[PDB]
Ligand binder design. Structure first.
Ligand code: SF4
Ligand code: F3S
Length: 106
Protein backbone atom coordinates (compact mmCIF):
# COMPACT_ATOMS: atom_id res chain seq x y z
CA UNK A 1 0.00 0.00 0.00
CA UNK A 2 0.90 3.61 -0.42
CA UNK A 3 0.05 6.02 2.43
CA UNK A 4 -0.92 9.76 2.59
CA UNK A 5 1.02 11.53 5.37
CA UNK A 6 1.01 14.85 7.25
CA UNK A 7 1.62 17.51 4.60
CA UNK A 8 -1.64 16.62 2.78
CA UNK A 9 -3.61 18.07 5.66
CA UNK A 10 -5.03 21.59 5.00
CA UNK A 11 -3.66 21.37 1.45
CA UNK A 12 -5.58 18.47 -0.15
CA UNK A 13 -4.65 19.27 -3.75
CA UNK A 14 -6.35 16.04 -5.04
CA UNK A 15 -3.93 15.72 -7.97
CA UNK A 16 -3.29 12.20 -6.72
CA UNK A 17 -6.71 10.69 -7.53
CA UNK A 18 -6.62 11.30 -11.30
CA UNK A 19 -3.88 8.73 -11.85
CA UNK A 20 -5.17 6.06 -9.53
CA UNK A 21 -6.15 3.17 -11.73
CA UNK A 22 -8.08 1.46 -8.93
CA UNK A 23 -9.75 4.53 -7.38
CA UNK A 24 -8.69 3.75 -3.84
CA UNK A 25 -8.54 7.33 -2.51
CA UNK A 26 -11.01 8.26 0.25
CA UNK A 27 -12.03 11.77 1.18
CA UNK A 28 -12.04 13.71 4.42
CA UNK A 29 -12.92 17.36 4.98
CA UNK A 30 -9.27 18.42 4.83
CA UNK A 31 -7.22 15.27 4.08
CA UNK A 32 -7.23 12.20 1.79
CA UNK A 33 -6.34 8.60 2.55
CA UNK A 34 -5.41 5.47 0.62
CA UNK A 35 -7.26 2.23 1.18
CA UNK A 36 -4.45 -0.27 1.72
CA UNK A 37 -6.44 -3.33 0.65
CA UNK A 38 -7.45 -1.84 -2.72
CA UNK A 39 -4.17 -0.04 -3.50
CA UNK A 40 -2.04 -2.05 -5.92
CA UNK A 41 1.25 -0.25 -5.30
CA UNK A 42 1.49 1.12 -8.86
CA UNK A 43 3.20 4.21 -7.34
CA UNK A 44 1.70 6.55 -9.91
CA UNK A 45 0.15 8.88 -7.36
CA UNK A 46 3.45 9.64 -5.61
CA UNK A 47 4.94 12.11 -8.09
CA UNK A 48 1.53 13.76 -8.56
CA UNK A 49 1.33 15.16 -5.03
CA UNK A 50 2.72 18.71 -4.84
CA UNK A 51 2.90 18.41 -1.06
CA UNK A 52 5.06 15.32 -1.44
CA UNK A 53 2.79 13.71 1.17
CA UNK A 54 2.53 10.27 -0.38
CA UNK A 55 4.93 7.43 0.48
CA UNK A 56 5.19 3.70 -0.10
CA UNK A 57 4.33 2.10 3.24
CA UNK A 58 7.91 0.96 3.74
CA UNK A 59 9.25 4.48 3.04
CA UNK A 60 6.99 6.38 5.44
CA UNK A 61 9.27 8.59 7.61
CA UNK A 62 9.77 7.34 11.15
CA UNK A 63 8.03 10.42 12.55
CA UNK A 64 4.85 9.75 10.55
CA UNK A 65 4.35 6.01 11.06
CA UNK A 66 0.98 6.68 12.70
CA UNK A 67 -0.30 7.65 9.28
CA UNK A 68 -0.10 4.04 8.09
CA UNK A 69 -2.87 2.70 10.24
CA UNK A 70 -4.61 6.06 10.13
CA UNK A 71 -5.08 5.63 6.37
CA UNK A 72 -6.40 2.15 6.89
CA UNK A 73 -8.87 3.32 9.60
CA UNK A 74 -10.22 6.34 7.83
CA UNK A 75 -10.39 4.60 4.45
CA UNK A 76 -13.14 2.45 5.96
CA UNK A 77 -15.34 5.44 6.93
CA UNK A 78 -14.75 8.21 4.37
CA UNK A 79 -16.41 8.43 0.94
CA UNK A 80 -14.47 7.48 -2.21
CA UNK A 81 -13.07 10.36 -4.27
CA UNK A 82 -12.21 9.74 -7.91
CA UNK A 83 -12.14 13.19 -9.41
CA UNK A 84 -9.82 16.16 -8.97
CA UNK A 85 -11.17 19.21 -7.20
CA UNK A 86 -9.83 22.62 -6.28
CA UNK A 87 -7.21 22.52 -3.50
CA UNK A 88 -8.23 23.83 -0.12
CA UNK A 89 -8.17 27.60 0.29
CA UNK A 90 -4.83 28.78 1.52
CA UNK A 91 -3.27 25.37 0.69
CA UNK A 92 0.01 27.15 -0.21
CA UNK A 93 0.20 28.68 3.27
CA UNK A 94 0.01 25.22 4.89
CA UNK A 95 2.28 23.36 2.48
CA UNK A 96 5.46 22.62 4.42
CA UNK A 97 4.05 23.40 7.86
CA UNK A 98 4.83 20.53 10.17
CA UNK A 99 2.65 18.51 12.58
CA UNK A 100 -0.60 19.29 10.79
CA UNK A 101 -2.05 16.09 12.25
CA UNK A 102 -3.25 18.31 15.10
CA UNK A 103 -5.51 20.00 12.49
CA UNK A 104 -6.94 16.77 10.97
CA UNK A 105 -10.74 16.93 10.67
CA UNK A 106 -12.90 13.84 10.67
S1 SF4 B 1 -0.04 3.59 -5.55
FE1 SF4 B 1 -1.38 3.34 -7.35
S2 SF4 B 1 -3.17 2.12 -6.63
FE2 SF4 B 1 -2.11 2.89 -4.79
S3 SF4 B 1 -3.10 4.79 -4.17
FE3 SF4 B 1 -1.35 5.34 -5.51
S4 SF4 B 1 -2.25 5.47 -7.57
FE4 SF4 B 1 -3.72 4.28 -6.39
S1 F3S C 1 -2.03 16.89 -0.90
FE1 F3S C 1 -3.29 15.21 -0.43
S2 F3S C 1 -5.07 15.19 -1.82
FE2 F3S C 1 -3.53 14.04 -2.93
S3 F3S C 1 -2.35 15.43 -4.21
FE3 F3S C 1 -1.30 15.35 -2.20
S4 F3S C 1 -2.09 13.47 -1.20
Amino acid sequence: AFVVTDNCIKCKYTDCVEVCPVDCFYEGPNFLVIHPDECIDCALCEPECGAQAIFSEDEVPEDMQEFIQLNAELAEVWPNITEKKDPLPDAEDWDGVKGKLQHLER
